Amino acid sequence: VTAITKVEREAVLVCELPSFDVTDVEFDLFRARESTDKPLDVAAAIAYRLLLGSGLPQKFGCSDEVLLNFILQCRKKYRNVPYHNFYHVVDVCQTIHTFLYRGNVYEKLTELECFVLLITALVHDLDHMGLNNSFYLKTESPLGILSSASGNTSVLEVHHCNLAVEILSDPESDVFDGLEGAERTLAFRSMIDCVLATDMAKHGSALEAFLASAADQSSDEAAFHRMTMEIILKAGDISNVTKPFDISRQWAMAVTEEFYRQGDMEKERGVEVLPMFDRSKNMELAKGQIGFIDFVAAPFFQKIVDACLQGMQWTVDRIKSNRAQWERVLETR
Ligand SMILES: COc1ccc(C2=NN(C3CCCCCC3)C(=O)[C@@H]3CC=CC[C@H]23)cc1OCCCCOc1ccc(-c2nnn[nH]2)cc1
Ligand SMILES: [Mg+2]
Ligand SMILES: [Zn+2]
Numbered sequence: 001v002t003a004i005t006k007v008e009r010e011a012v013l014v015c016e017l018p019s020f021d022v023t024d025v026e027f028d029l030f031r032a033r034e035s036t037d038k039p040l041d042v043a044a045a046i047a048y049r050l051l052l053g054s055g056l057p058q059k060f061g062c063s064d065e066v067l068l069n070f071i072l073q074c075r076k077k078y079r080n081v082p083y084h085n086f087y088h089v090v091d092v093c094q095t096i097h098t099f100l101y102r103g104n105v106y107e108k109l110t111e112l113e114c115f116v117l118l119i120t121a122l123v124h125d126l127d128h129m130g131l132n133n134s135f136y137l138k139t140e141s142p143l144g145i146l147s148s149a150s151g152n153t154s155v156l157e158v159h160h161c162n163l164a165v166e167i168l169s170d171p172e173s174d175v176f177d178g179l180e181g182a183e184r185t186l187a188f189r190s191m192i193d194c195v196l197a198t199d200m201a202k203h204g205s206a207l208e209a210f211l212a213s214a215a216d217q218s219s220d221e222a223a224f225h226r227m228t229m230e231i232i233l234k235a236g237d238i239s240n241v242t243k244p245f246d247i248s249r250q251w252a253m254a255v256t257e258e259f260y261r262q263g264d265m266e267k268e269r270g271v272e273v274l275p276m277f278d279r280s281k282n283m284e285l286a287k288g289q290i291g292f293i294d295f296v297a298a299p300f301f302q303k304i305v306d307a308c309l310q311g312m313q314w315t316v317d318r319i320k321s322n323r324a325q326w327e328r329v330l331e332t333r
Pocket of ligand 1: 198200217238240241248249253254255275287288289291292294295
């Protein structure tokens, strides 16, 4: 991979983010992106500020310049798609920062694990093309064939890990270059385990494992830590419904458009198009959000908060408030 330039770094470093608190649970990334005509630079500056503010990179021998180079190498591998773009991963990083520090989940993890989770957020969807794992398998695309042949159906998640490893193989963008031995190994393994756990086909089993470990006072400590990391990255990845309504709605619009684009390509290839991906089904945004709330997000957040993560109660409260607001949209239609 080609080295990040001085000029690229400077375009991020000029962004001052006046009037934003990147640590706040009501921080608004959409407003941040509308605040200037260089939203990719503002997004990178948000990630840079979150990581320096944690005080963690400093502790692990990662210089300011190596951090910024890493952020920019991640940025170059995100595509111009409606949802799974650079803004999604910065949002996940910011959201995880709030879970760790506003929700006090940092108390369950080492400082290194906190640092790994914040970094992992930025790599977890590298080179996403706006198509899900199912698309690659149904169309027998080359990447799908490779996944089936090699025995792992998490087509995208393995791909994301490959590209993360590539970025980290150059010292100038290796945020773990200050580590060695077991610490270095833990950093890479925990990052990869977390990325692999973001495949939604593994949602129920990842949640059940975490819950069983949290309930067991004799759970293996290293295993509990690892599952806690996995669960936090998953939480960030389905956190759009835990945000103030207008932010939540803007994420819902972006993800719907990305799904519809997949369905349009699936039609053209003559493969199965699920209702959720079909433009001509006209499905209402409100009903889709209520369904995602009721069947995925509300139970996930309630269960993890009740099991262990009491400081994250606000997520459950905001989901409830958003559900009531979508119900008002239906009531008044
Ligand atoms: C802003 O709103 C979203 C944000 C993210 C998503 C995602 N979605 N998903 C999948 C989508 C297909 C199967 C359902 C599981 C979630 C991803 O993999 C994406 C990649 C990784 C993390 C979550 C992302 C979806 C978002 O809205 C989707 C709204 C449409 C309705 O959704 C429902 C979802 C399940 C039910 C259901 N009923 N019974 N059991 N389950 C009913 C309705
Ligand atoms: Mg993903
Ligand atoms: Zn994601």
